[PDB]
Structures are given as C-alpha cells and as structure tokens.
Tab-separated table of C-alpha atoms (C1' of nucleotides) in Angstrom:
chain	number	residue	atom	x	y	z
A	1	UNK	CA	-236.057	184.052	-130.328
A	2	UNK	CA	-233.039	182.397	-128.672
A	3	UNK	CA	-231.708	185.137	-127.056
A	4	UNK	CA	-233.417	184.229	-124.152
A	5	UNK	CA	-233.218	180.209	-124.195
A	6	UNK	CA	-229.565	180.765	-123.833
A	7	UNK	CA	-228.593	181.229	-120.527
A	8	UNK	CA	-231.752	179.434	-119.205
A	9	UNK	CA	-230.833	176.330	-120.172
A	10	UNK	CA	-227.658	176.203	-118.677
A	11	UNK	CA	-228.463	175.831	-115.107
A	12	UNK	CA	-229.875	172.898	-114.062
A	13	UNK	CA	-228.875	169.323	-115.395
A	14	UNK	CA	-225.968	170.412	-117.212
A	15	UNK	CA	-227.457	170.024	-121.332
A	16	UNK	CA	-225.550	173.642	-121.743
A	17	UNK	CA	-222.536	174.431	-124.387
A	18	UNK	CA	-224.387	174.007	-127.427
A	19	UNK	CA	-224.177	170.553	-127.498
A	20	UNK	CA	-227.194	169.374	-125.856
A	21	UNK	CA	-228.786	171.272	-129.479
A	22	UNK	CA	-226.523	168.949	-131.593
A	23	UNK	CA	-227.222	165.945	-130.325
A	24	UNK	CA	-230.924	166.721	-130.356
A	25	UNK	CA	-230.912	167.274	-134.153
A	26	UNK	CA	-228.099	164.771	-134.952
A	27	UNK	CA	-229.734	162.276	-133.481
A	28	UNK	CA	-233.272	163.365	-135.342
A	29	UNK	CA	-231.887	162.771	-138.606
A	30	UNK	CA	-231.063	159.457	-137.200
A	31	UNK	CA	-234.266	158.426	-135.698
A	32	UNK	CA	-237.346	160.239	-137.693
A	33	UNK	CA	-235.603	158.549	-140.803
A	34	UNK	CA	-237.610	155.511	-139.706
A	35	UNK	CA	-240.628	157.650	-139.835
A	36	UNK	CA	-240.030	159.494	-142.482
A	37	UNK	CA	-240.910	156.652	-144.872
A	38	UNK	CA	-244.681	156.014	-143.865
A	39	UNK	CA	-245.252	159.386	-143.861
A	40	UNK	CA	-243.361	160.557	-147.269
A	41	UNK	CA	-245.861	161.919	-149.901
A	42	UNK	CA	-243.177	162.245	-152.725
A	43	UNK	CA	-243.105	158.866	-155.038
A	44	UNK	CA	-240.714	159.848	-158.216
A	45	UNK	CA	-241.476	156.364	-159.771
A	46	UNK	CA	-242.660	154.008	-156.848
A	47	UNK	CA	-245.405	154.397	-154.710
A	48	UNK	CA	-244.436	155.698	-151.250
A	49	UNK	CA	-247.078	157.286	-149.006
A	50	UNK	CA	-247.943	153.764	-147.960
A	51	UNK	CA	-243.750	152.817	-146.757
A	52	UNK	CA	-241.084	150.720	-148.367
A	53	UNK	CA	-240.186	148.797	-145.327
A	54	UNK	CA	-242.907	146.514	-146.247
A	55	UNK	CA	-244.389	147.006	-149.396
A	56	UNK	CA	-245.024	142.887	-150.402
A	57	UNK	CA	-248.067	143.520	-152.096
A	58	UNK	CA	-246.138	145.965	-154.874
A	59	UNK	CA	-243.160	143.880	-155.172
A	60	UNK	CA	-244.863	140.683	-155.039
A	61	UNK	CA	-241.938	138.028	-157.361
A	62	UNK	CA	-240.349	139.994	-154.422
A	63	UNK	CA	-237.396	141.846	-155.117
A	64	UNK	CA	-235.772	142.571	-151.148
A	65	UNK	CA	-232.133	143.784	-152.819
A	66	UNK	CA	-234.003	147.014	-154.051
A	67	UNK	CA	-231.930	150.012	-155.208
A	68	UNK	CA	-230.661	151.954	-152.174
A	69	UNK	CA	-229.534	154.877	-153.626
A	70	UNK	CA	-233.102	157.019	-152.169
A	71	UNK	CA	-234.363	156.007	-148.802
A	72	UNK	CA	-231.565	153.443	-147.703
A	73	UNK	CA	-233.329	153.066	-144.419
A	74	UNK	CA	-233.549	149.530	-145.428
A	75	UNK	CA	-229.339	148.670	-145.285
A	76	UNK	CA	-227.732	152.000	-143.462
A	77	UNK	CA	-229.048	150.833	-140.578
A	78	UNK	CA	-227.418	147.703	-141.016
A	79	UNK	CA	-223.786	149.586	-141.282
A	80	UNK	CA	-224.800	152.096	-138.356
A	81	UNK	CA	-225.698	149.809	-135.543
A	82	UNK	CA	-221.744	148.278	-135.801
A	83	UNK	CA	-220.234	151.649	-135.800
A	84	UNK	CA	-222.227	152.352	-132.619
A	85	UNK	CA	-220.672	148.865	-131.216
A	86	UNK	CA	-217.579	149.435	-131.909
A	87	UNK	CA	-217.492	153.235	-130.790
A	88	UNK	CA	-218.817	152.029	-127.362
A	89	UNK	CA	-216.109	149.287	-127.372
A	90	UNK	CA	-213.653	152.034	-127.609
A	91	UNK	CA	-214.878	154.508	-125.664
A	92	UNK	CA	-214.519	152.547	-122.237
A	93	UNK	CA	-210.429	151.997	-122.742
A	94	UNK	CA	-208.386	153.744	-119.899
A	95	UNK	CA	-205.292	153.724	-118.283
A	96	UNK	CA	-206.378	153.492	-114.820
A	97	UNK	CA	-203.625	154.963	-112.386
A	98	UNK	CA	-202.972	154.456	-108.325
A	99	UNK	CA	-204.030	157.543	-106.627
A	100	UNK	CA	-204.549	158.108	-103.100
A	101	UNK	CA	-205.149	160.921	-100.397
A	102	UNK	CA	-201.801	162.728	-99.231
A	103	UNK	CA	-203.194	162.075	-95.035
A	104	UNK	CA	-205.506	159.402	-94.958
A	105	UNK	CA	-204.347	155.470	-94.513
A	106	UNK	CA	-207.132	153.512	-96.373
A	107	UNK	CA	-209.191	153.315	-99.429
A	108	UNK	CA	-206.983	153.584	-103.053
A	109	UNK	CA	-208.831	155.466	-105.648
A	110	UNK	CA	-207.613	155.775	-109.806
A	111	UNK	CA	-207.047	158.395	-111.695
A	112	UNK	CA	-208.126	157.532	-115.336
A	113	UNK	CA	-207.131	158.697	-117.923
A	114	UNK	CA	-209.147	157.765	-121.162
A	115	UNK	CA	-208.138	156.606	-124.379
A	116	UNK	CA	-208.763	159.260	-126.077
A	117	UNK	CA	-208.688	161.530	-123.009
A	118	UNK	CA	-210.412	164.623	-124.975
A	119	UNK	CA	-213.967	165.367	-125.335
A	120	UNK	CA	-214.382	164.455	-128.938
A	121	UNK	CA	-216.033	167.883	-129.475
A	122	UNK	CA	-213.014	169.830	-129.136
A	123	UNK	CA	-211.039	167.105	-131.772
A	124	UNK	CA	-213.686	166.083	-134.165
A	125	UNK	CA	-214.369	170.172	-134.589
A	126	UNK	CA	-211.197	170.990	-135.371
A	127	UNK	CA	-211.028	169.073	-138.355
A	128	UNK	CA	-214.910	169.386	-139.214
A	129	UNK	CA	-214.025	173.223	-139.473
A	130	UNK	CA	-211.063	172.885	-141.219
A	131	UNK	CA	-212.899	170.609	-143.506
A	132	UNK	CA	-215.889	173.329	-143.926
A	133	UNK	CA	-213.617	176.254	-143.930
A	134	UNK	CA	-211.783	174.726	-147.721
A	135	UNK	CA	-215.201	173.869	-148.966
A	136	UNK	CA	-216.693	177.507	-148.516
A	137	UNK	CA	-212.865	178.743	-149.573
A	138	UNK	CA	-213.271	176.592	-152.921
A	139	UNK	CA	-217.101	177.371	-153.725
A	140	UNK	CA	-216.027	181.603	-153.160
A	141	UNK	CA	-213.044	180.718	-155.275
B	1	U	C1'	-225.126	143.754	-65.859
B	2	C	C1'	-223.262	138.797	-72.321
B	3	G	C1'	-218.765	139.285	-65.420
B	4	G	C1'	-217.364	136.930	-61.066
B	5	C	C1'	-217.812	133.833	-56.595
B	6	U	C1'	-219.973	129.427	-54.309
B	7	C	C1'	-222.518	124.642	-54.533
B	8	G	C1'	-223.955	120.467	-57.240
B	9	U	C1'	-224.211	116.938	-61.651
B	10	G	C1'	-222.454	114.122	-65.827
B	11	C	C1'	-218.119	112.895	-68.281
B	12	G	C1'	-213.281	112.353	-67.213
B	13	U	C1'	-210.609	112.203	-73.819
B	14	C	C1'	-202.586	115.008	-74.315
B	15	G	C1'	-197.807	113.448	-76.888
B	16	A	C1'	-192.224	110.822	-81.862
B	17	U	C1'	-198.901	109.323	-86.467
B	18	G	C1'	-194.855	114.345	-82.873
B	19	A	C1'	-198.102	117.441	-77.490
B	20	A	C1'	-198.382	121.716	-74.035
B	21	G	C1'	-195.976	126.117	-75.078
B	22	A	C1'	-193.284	129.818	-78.364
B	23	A	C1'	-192.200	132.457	-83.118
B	24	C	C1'	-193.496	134.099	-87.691
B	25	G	C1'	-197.073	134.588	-91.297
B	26	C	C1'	-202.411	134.760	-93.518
B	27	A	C1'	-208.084	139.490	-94.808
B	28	G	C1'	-209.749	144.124	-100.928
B	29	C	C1'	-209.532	148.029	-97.498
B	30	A	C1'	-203.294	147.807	-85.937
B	31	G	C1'	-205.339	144.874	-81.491
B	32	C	C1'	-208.311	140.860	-79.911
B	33	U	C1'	-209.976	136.662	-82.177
B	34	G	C1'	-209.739	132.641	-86.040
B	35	C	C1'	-206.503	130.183	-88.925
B	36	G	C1'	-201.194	127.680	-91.543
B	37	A	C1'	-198.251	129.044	-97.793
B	38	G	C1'	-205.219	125.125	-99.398
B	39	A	C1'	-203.290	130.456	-93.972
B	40	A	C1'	-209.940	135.709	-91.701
B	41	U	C1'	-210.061	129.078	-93.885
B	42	U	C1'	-210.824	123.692	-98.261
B	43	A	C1'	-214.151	119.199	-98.461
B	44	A	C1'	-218.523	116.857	-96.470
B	45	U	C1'	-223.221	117.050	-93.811
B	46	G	C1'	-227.319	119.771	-91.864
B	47	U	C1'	-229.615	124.366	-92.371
B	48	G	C1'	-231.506	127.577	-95.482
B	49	A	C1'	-231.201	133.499	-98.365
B	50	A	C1'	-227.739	136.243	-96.430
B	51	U	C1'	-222.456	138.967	-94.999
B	52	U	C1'	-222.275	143.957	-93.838
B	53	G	C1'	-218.161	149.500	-91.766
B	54	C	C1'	-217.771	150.415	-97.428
B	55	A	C1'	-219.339	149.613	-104.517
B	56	G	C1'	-217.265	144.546	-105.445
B	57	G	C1'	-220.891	136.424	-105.473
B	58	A	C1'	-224.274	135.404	-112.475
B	59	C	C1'	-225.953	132.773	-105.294
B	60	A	C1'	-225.956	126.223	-111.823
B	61	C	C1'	-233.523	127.534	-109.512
B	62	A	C1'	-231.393	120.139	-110.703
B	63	U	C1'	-231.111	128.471	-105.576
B	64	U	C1'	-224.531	122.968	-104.890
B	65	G	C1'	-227.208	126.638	-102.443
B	66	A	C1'	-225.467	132.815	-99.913
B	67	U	C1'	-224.949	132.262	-94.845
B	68	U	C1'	-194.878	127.088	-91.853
B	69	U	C1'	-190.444	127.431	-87.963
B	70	C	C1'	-188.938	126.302	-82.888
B	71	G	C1'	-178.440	114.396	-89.531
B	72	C	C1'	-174.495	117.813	-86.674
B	73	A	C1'	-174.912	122.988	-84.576
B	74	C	C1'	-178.280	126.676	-83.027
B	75	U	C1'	-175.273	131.167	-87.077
B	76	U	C1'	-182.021	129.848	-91.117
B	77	G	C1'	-174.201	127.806	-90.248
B	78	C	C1'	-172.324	122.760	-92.315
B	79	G	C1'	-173.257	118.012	-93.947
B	80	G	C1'	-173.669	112.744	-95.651
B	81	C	C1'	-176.635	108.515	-98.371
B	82	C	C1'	-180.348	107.084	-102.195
B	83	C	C1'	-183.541	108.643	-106.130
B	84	C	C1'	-185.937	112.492	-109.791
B	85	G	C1'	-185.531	116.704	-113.201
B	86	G	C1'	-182.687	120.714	-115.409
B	87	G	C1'	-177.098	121.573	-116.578
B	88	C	C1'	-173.435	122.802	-110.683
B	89	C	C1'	-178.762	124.090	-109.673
B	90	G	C1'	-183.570	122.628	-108.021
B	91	G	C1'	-187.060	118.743	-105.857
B	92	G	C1'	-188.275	114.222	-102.849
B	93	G	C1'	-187.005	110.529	-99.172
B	94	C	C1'	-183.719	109.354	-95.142
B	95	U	C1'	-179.764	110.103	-91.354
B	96	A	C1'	-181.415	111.552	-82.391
B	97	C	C1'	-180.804	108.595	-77.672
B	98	G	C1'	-182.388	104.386	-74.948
RNA sequence: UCGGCUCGUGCGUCGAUGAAGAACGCAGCAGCUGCGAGAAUUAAUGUGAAUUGCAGGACACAUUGAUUUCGCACUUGCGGCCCCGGGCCGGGGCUACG
C-alpha cells in the first residue's frame, strides 16, 4: 500500500522525508478536535452528540468553568495559541553575517545563521527517541 | 539630429552680509551632474500619485501628500583677549590694510 506512494511523492514541491506525513496527522489531532465535539456520539454522563462548545440550554444557571479533564477543547486552546506565538517569535532570531561575492564590486548579501540553526527534526527526535526507547525498555522490563 | 552658426528682441541683476575661481567632501548599492557636515538636499508654495537599474516610504485619506577649506604664517604650524562647560581639555565670540 505505500510502497508505491514513496518515491512518488518526493519529486515535485518538496513535501518528501517523511515529514510532510507528520505534519499532516499532527496537525489533525490539532484541528478535527474542534470537530470532533459536534460529531461525538459517546456521552458517559452528559449529553454530547449535540457539542459542548455551546450547550446553554443544558447548563442553563450556567456553569462556563466546566470540568476539563474530557474534551478540554474549551481551555487547551487557550494555552496552545501562545505557544504558537511565542515559537514564531523565536523562530525568526538570526545572526545575520556580511557576505559577499569573491569578484564582483556591488550588492552585500548575509549569511544567516539561525538561532537554533538545526532543523528541529533532527533535535527534537533525538530526545523523542530516547524518551520512547526507556518507555518500551521499562514496559519489556 | 535634444548640436552648432547667424540675425533679431526684451532685460541688463557680482563682491568683506565676503564674489568669480579652486580644493575636499556628500547617495543603500567611478564620471558627468546636483549639492555643503541639515551635503544626490531641509522648510514653504504650487502641483498632484509616483521614483525606478535593483527588494527596501504605513505615502496621517484632515493621501502633509509620493513625485566645509582656500590674528601671524601658509607647515591644517603658532598665538593673544573675553566668556561658557568639564578638570589642562573642549566650545563660542573677537583680533587684516586703507
């Protein structure tokens, strides 16, 4: 079944390395959590298959501080939105250095090198696999 | 042919309040040209949305609104007088002949 979607995909925009996968389902979780509210069927002991983002008429009086331990859709995305600020805010520090061609009299261009200066797959990996390798290491053992 | 030459017309305005001329410097990226450390121009007015070789003006929509060097001497040499500030240093104003 994927055999064949994997050097396909590669050529072409560039979406290739596996990543363009992750970022489809990481982002899913994300994004159909939204969704997944009007359309859950399970209640286990308040009514959902008609949402909880508004649900006046069963509350009301009106209790808005529910419990947010199932379905926090209500304050996560709250927390989430100022992690994605401050990420961004981050992510666009360089040191910007004077470069310029060996020949030609002219234009300056800069080299920059970022703040963090590596692709975050090939640092955030090696301690998520680390992190996954004790878990499965513990659970065997 | 965005240059000359020739003729004609009107005007006919330089300078110690420092001229003509010279030097040096000024553009985000030599010359010519334009400018003077406010240096590829500031203000104002009119005009009105461009400048442009290249990305880079929030252009308040009341589109205010784009378009220096050339007192004594000429080596930056040496002063003097009066103030100001910092503790000798810096700044300002003076100091040619008739």
């Amino acid at each position: 079944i994927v055999l064949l979607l994997d050097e396909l995909l590669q050529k072409g925009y560039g979406l290739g390395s596996g990543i363009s996968l992750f970022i489809a389902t990481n982002i899913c979780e994300t994004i159909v959590w939204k969704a997944f509210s009007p359309t859950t069927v399970n209640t286990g002991r308040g009514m959902e298959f008609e949402g909880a983002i508004i649900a006046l008429f069963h509350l009301l009086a009106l209790r808005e501080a529910f419990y947010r331990q199932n379905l926090p859709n209500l304050m996560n995305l709250i927390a989430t939105i100022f992690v994605f600020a401050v990420v961004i805010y981050f992510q666009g520090f360089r040191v910007d250095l004077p470069i310029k061609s060996a020949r030609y009299r002219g234009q300056y261009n800069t080299y920059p090198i970022k703040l963090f200066y590596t692709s975050n797959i090939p640092i955030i990996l090696q301690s998520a696999l680390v992190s996954n390798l004790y878990v499965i290491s513990q659970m065997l053992s």
